Symmetry: C3
Subunit: 169 residues, 3 copies
């Protein structure tokens, strides 16, 4: 089967979309408008549910555009096969709280939003509007075998136990 | 073969466990109790070694529960095939050091731990107990081809060189 | 085909290299020498272009050595199939700006670099030299199906809607 079951949970939800024909992931739309202060953490609702078949995992991960330009950090979520719940974007405004005020909010383009109302926000605060693409869903196959406890492994590897920068830099 | 060789390195080690029948990763137990101050970095030992077969990679990655609730950031580790060493959780308490004291430590549920002894900890400090699931192991297949230097690619793509938010937002 | 098309864009570019025979990723060399202050963000050029075939994604991701030892955080980039552009390492010096001076820069080994010239740098500043391996490219297969809007999914899963630490910890 070359089909994925996607369910829209609300009117605020929008169906994921792939950018180019040969692209890896389906861009994820935010279902809610959230303002994030420096160091603030949140799980942004997408109101989108998927039925990933067995033997596959969905990687709910950040986009290079938003991530490189803004301080919004998204933890790559491992969407289990059969997770029929509301996909949540595990997010954090990783900007430092230097404790000085500003009068502008910052959009996902790192640009200061222009508004007629006068407000005092914390510096580094971001606004994410409903319907904006802040994430993407890359679905990769997995290998889930039966685990086996052993005293020692049947063969020696060229790597051995070497890791964490054992080679040069 | 539908079997993975797992070796326990100590009595503090516990064998990885999959939550649901169709889930993606095997939950990783911590083999040591560590207290992490704000901004502090560590590599937490699991005392668990795996023999991943050739053509596959293990993704030693964070769990959504711990990551969304706490300031503990785990870098997704790429466990090479044949790495027979001690799996280390590349971790950081990404909480800001605002330089004010507290009398409670915070567990992996972001709750303040109750204890009879009186101590002064830094605000944002986390305690990770031995035997607690803070990570998971998702094993995905890989494609390792022979690299080839070319003057130019044989075909043009619809994407071209476009990237880093070349589409909208 | 067991071949990947790699193009070098400049004399500063170096072709990716795999550490061990059975390793997952090809180590990525930096094409430029960059000094990163605390909290500073950048996209480091590699001057290396790849032609990943359809049905695969490249994961431009951090190395365990550099990541665990330094404050340099690299966001795992999802290199689309047919992205013929300059691979950019989405990086950030996630070290806290505590606003105190130092006279040494810090290399990717977290060691203070010795130099005859006297300068005042910010504490937590890192220097990344041209030709140093700070990243790696792990290529995994993907599953890009045709999406389908449904009122409800055809079957019930044992997981259901449970997530974000629904099991224990
Ligand atoms: O979080 C991690 C990451 C890696 N590892 C192990 C698995 C892997 O085989 C090894 C190093 O992986 P990488 O090649 O990705 N990092 P690095 O290039 O720094 O190590 P080396 O120089 O030995 O390849 O360390 C962990 O135990 N935990
Ligand atoms: O770290 C990275 C991430 C991506 N890239 C490249 C590869 C990919 O094909 C392209 C953008 O990938 P994404 O679609 O995941 N991010 P975004 O949606 O912001 O870019 P676009 O809008 O062009 O799709 O940039 C890098 O060179 N380095
Ligand atoms: O960013 C995310 C991450 C996960 N999820 C969903 C998908 C997955 O099936 C579920 C939890 O995934 P994990 O098993 O990796 N984390 P955790 O172990 O904390 O949840 P549980 O205890 O329920 O397994 O939550 C999201 O919606 N967004
Ligand atoms: Mg995109
Ligand atoms: Mg789990
Ligand atoms: Mg390496
Ligand atoms: Ni800034
Ligand atoms: Ni930070
Ligand atoms: Ni807090
Ligand atoms: Ni330090």
């Amino acid at each position: 089967t070359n089909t994925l079951q996607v369910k829209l949970l609300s009117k605020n939800a929008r169906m994921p979309e792939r950018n180019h024909k040969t692209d890896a992931g389906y861009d994820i739309f935010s279902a809610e408008t959230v303002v994030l202060e420096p160091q603030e953490k949140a799980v942004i609702k997408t109101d989108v549910a998927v039925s990933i078949p067995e033997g596959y995992v969905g990687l709910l991960t950040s986009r290079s555009g938003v991530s490189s330009k803004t301080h919004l950090v998204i933890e790559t979520g491992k969407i289990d096969a059969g997770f029929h719940g509301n996909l949540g974007i595990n997010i954090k405004n990783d900007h430092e709280d230097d404790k000085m005020q500003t009068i502008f909010l910052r959009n996902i383009d790192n640009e200061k939003i222009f508004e007629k109302e006068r407000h005092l926000y914390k510096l580094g605060s971001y606004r994410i509007e409903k319907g904006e693409r802040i994430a993407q869903l890359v679905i990769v196959p997995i290998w889930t075998p039966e685990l086996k406890q052993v005293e020692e492994f049947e063969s020696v590897s060229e790597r051995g136990e070497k890791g964490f920068g054992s080679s040069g830099v």
